[PDB]
Amino acid sequence: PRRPKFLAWGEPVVLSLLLLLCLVLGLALAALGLSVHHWDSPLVQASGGSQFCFGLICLGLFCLSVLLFPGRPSSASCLAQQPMAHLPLTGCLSTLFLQAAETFVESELPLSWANWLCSYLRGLWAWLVVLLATFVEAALCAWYLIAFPPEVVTDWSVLPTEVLEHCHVRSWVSLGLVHITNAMLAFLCFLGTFLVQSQPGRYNRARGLTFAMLAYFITWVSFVPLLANVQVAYQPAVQMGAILVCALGILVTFHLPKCYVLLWLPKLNTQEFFL
Amino acid sequence: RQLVFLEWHEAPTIAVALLAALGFLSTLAILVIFWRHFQTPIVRSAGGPMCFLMLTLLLVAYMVVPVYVGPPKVSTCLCRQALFPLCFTICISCIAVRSFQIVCAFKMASRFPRAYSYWVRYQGPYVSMAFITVLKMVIVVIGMLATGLSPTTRTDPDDPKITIVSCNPNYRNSLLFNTSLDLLLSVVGFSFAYMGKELPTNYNEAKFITLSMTFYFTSSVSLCTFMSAYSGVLVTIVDLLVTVLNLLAISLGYFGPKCYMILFYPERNTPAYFNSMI
């Protein structure tokens, strides 16, 4: 007789990803701790102050979202899987988009427009931009959960002696409805930074932003063919891996080197070098 | 069963046609703005008549859509397979050559003149463009006349009542062997242009080459991923959308800044100013 099949808590494919989750979340919260301890210093203020902390928190939630994929499916899990990941991801990426906006405006624009426009990339209006991005993401997710909601599917035939239960996406083309906003924010962030030229004797945000978006796009380009090719039993594993590796790609590339400067090289944390 | 091919009633078909119309009209505007200012530094530094050749090729390439749409014939097979893609590759080759010239020439002259003078003399630039041109042309001819000049059809994978009509058998493989040479050219031009990001030599066009090659690279990778993960009816219009987006990525992404400066920074078109950039 047939037995059900799904990613089990304790299967090595799940444990090896939970350890990765532990590493990524620990790094994110350690970076937040260093940020809180050095809250007032130039390296934090030049990162938008509380914007830095909020981005790290959004990344932490983005990482914690993976706990919905493995285990016995349920309708709530099926509907929650994608939004619970990509909404915090928008909340994170919008802050990097603001950093890219600053670094672009202050390097590739006439000085009058630079000194005018820069005022609206700080304070209340920066939170306005973040809130707008989050609202658009939520609206497209509300569209997704009505036009293309996934379902718990029991598939008796695709395995030789087992029953597959999986959160069936109706079609991959429908899954872009939740990706598009984050992807466009990432692409704009990349274009805003990847061609900047560094002034001598000062910090260079553009390289960090550029490499972070490059890792993002590498991850999500690799994600598609893996999802297409992998055995039907392990697509949740691919989705979890993509989420965690994307979070790691951002974390190791943008926040972590600032933490390293705080720890090893505090002599650089000066008004002249960062501001 | 029922045959399927692009037609003017469809929402995505008319959307792509409108996008192509925008591209064609903008390219024509570029060409005429150039023609009036034919005697001035911004266009003379662009190589003059070569840019009009390139813009004519782009104008012709934008004419693809009315030939791409509708029930195919052998002539439309030739058009879809060879005639327009070759027009695209010709342009990309010239962009790559200019990217090489801008950044590498002075260094090579200072460091390897005894070898580089072989490229300086004879007709080095035209030689490179012609070599790449015939390479792409012969590859295209081999593929097309091997796979056939008649239309091809397949059964839809999830609504088998409809059969899909196209001109490129084994679509993913055909696109791979079509676009590999263009990817090589893209990477080479991007490398040289990025190494040239600081240089003003010809109104900073290394920066715009970098931008346009980025717009081409992302679209090419997106198309390859999509074809690696989808097989339904949409393929034969996603390919067209990507083609039009590439033609835009060139027509706007490389020429637009030049005409923008012609219109709104005419002071920089003065020879006394150009002498500070040359």
Side-chain angles (χ1 to χ4, degrees), chain B residues 3 7 12 43 107 149 162 164 171 186 190 197 203 221 262 272:
Chain B
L3 283 64
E7 290 187 321
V43 295
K107 301 180 180 184
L149 302 182
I162 52 161
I164 304 160
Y171 63 95
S186 171
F190 178 101
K197 67 180 179 175
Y203 292 96
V221 167
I262 285 171

Side-chain angles (χ1 to χ4, degrees), chain A residues 162-257:
Chain A
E162 300 171 307
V163 191
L164 181 66
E165 300 180 11
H166 64 293
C167 322
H168 195 194
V169 166
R170 299 177 191 266
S171 59
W172 315 128
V173 174
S174 68
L175 182 53
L177 180 55
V178 297
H179 283 81
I180 181 58
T181 300
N182 286 309
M184 81 180 193
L185 283 179
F187 183 49
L188 293 169
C189 184
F190 175 83
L191 285 179
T193 61
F194 85 117
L195 205 44
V196 171
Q197 179 70 345
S198 56
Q199 300 86 354
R202 294 182 77 262
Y203 187 70
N204 188 19
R205 291 182 275 176
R207 186 180 292 174
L209 293 168
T210 301
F211 294 166
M213 298 303 91
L214 180 59
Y216 175 98
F217 278 121
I218 288 167
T219 303
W220 291 109
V221 165
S222 184
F223 159 73
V224 173
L226 286 171
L227 191 67
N229 289 351
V230 72
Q231 305 179 22
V232 292
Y234 286 151
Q235 287 178 338
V238 170
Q239 283 171 94
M240 295 171 64
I243 284 171
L244 288 182
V245 170
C246 172
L248 182 75
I250 295 175
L251 181 52
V252 171
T253 311
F254 186 56
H255 310 287
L256 186 56

